């Protein structure tokens, strides 16, 4: 007979959280940034187009040197391109034809891929004996893999589709910490610049901030009206942006516990498939389901421009560490570099 | 120097491109099929003829390689991973015969999904013997769970069932018409449905899939030439 008491306590705690959020809010971001010069119209052209994939590209990850990038497509191939010369350095034929994500190690020695097999495969690239094979096959997830990120050469964080995120440990094959609390499939995750926290956007229209060292959720951010398909930490590390299926992008804050700004246009209704930030954190390049990416001014919520060069919907995009170029991958098996 | 590195990179790229072409020559010669359906629909019996998340079943007929994927091992929620199966030649659907209403709503959601509009579905009305026994015993009824069987009339256009009683044919074609009404209620001529009455021990199912894939590819080729 404690169900009513538990529900009442939960409602009271939610009301207290709402009151605390209201108290800490005094002026919106729109009324505090209306004194700066607008960026103006911006335009970037496709400097390079990378061809060779046979199926739709679902993920891509730039290297830490802004020279090499990996791309995963549904034809069971992992191609490691050379951005400068449009050369295919490697081509790894995966044993699974339904890879949904890919990752590049910060040191560049290993790569990762996961999909509809609940297994994260680590491929060793630094070995040079005529063979490039899978080193470790991480198994233990129940739902499909959605996004994997490397913390170190021996640690990788994976976000499965069974409402659970896990911190793995290569060279052993077993997990270290399991993150629980989501009620929907986790679609994306992004590591903090200092590699201590990471957010995860799930299909419950909520994002949770996790502590890697401990393994408990710190804050939960709400406000989106549909499933969150992408997420990306702000370069400062104290904020992040969420791309949901309600055709709105929202920028949350890690210190105010509430949303800051929304990026919506009445003339477009399409879910956001990928979200990334520039080097300075001023532009929000978010891809859409209407076959092009839109560049958003984070400070003013005004569209700076649109990158329309893809035949099909963009499923992945990422700006390099140095901010020189942004690469977007669509479902037409074409990888393009924009500068 | 830059010259040696460039030459080595060009050689490696040429070798990798040759490998990519070789793999493309065999990737386009295989058709991918997604085997989907509600639980206890008898699809596991077809699978076993030949835990993870995707089961691969490689079978061939008339020199043509087919790649059928079973999605067992995933969670119930499927609005996200179903978008990956948009390049499949067909989506095999198995329906057990309110267990039928759930399958009807699932097929409806599949039909008008914006990313599944191009793909066509093959419909397998499994467990015909169970339906015949249920409708002959009289313990349960379908009129109470579907207030359309009372006014429903048998379609005189097609009823090639020699040994079947009128009632079992009425039930079978009523289920088929219920699926077809949803299929053709909002179609745009881009995808079609292929109902099939199959039992749990039918060895023709692979031939049915082969013929339906042939028809799908023929219609796609006709569309690309703007004839249809």
């Amino acid at each position, epitope marked *: 007979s404690e169900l009513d008491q538990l529900r009442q306590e939960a409602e009271q705690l939610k009301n207290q959280i709402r009151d605390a959020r209201k108290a800490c809010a005094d002026a919106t971001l729109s009324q505090i940034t209306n004194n700066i010069d607008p960026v103006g119209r911006i335009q970037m052209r496709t400097r390079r187009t990378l061809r060779g994939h046979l199926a739709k590209i679902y993920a891509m990850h730039w290297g830490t040197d802004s020279r090499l990038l990996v791309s995963a497509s549904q034809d069971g191939k992992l191609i490691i391109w050379d951005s400068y010369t449009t050369n295919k350095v490697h081509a790894i034929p995966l044993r699974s034809s339904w890879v949904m994500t890919c990752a590049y190690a910060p040191s560049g020695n290993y790569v990762a891929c996961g999909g509809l097999d609940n297994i994260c495969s680590i491929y060793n690239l630094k070995t040079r004996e005529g063979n490039v094979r899978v080193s470790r096959e991480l198994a233990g997830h129940t739902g499909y893999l959605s996004c994997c990120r490397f913390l170190d050469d021996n640690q990788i964080v994976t976000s499965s589709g069974d409402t659970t995120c896990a911190l793995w440990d290569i060279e052993t094959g077993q997990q270290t910490t399991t993150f629980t609390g989501h009620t929907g499939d986790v679609m994306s995750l992004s590591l903090a610049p200092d590699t201590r926290l990471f957010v995860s956007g799930a299909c*419950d229209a909520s994002a949770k901030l996790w502590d890697v060292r401990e393994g408990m959720c710190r804050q939960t951010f709400t406000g989106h009206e549909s*499933d969150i398909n992408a997420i990306c930490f702000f370069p400062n590390g104290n904020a992040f942006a969420t791309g949901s299926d*309600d055709a709105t992008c929202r920028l949350f804050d890690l210190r105010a516990d509430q949303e800051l700004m929304t990026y919506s246009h009445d003339n477009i*209704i399409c879910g956001i498939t990928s979200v990334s930030f520039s080097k300075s954190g001023r532009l929000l390049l978010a891809g859409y389901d209407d076959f092009n990416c839109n560049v958003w001014d984070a400070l003013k919520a005004d569209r700076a421009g649109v990158l329309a060069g893809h035949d099909n919907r963009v499923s992945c995009l990422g700006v390099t560490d140095d901010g020189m170029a942004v690469a977007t991958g669509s479902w037409d098996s074409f990888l393009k570099i924009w500068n | 120097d830059q010259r040696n590195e460039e030459k080595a990179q060009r050689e490696a790229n040429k070798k990798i491109e040759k490998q990519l072409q070789k793999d493309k020559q065999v990737y386009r010669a295989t058709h991918r099929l997604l085997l989907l359906g509600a639980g206890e629909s008898g699809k596991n019996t077809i699978v076993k003829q030949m835990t993870s998340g995707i089961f691969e079943t490689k079978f061939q007929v008339d020199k043509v390689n087919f790649h059928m994927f079973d999605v067992g091992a995933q969670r*119930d929620e499927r609005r996200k991973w*179903i978008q990956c199966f948009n390049d499949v030649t067909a989506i095999i659907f198995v329906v057990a015969s*309110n267990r039928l*209403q759930a399958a009807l709503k699932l097929f409806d*959601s599949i039909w008008n999904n914006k990313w599944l509009r191009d793909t066509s579905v093959i419909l397998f009305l499994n467990k015909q013997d169970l339906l015949a026994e249920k409708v002959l015993a009289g313990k349960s009824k379908i009129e109470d*769970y579907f207030p359309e069987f009372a006014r429903y009339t048998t379609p005189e256009d097609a009823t090639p069932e020699p040994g079947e009683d009128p009632r079992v044919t009425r039930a079978k074609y009523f289920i088929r018409d219920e699926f077809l009404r949803i299929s053709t209620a909002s179609g745009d001529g881009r995808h079609y449905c292929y109902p099939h009455f199959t039992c749990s021990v039918d060895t023709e199912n692979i031939r049915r899939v082969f013929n339906d894939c042939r028809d799908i590819i023929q219609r796609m080729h006709l569309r690309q030439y703007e004839l249809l």
Partner: nanobody
Amino acid sequence: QVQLQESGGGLVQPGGSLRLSCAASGFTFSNYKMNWVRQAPGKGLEWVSDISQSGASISYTGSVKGRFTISRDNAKNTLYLQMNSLKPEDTAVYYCARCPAPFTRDCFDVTSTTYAYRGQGTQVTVSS
């Protein structure tokens, strides 16, 4: 945050009339589809009825077809299911299901065991 709060439901005689109003909040009402789901004891979740956006297409399941009458009040952020002539087989916990994506008719995963946007629900039972 999406919070669908229901109303109504109590011990009534068979053949009676009930009303279940769902108080939608946290999202734009006239952008999503809505469904009705019930969970009979000892049985799985089942789909009762659905109403398209702006009340264009109304459809019911076979059991309740021709009996209930849904209504979407977009301005007041509420959705009804006017029960009438109840039967001892309609005793189940009813929930309002928000449809996963806006401006889309595919509307997947409504009757899943764990659905994030589904409302809390109220217990509806009939007996004497």
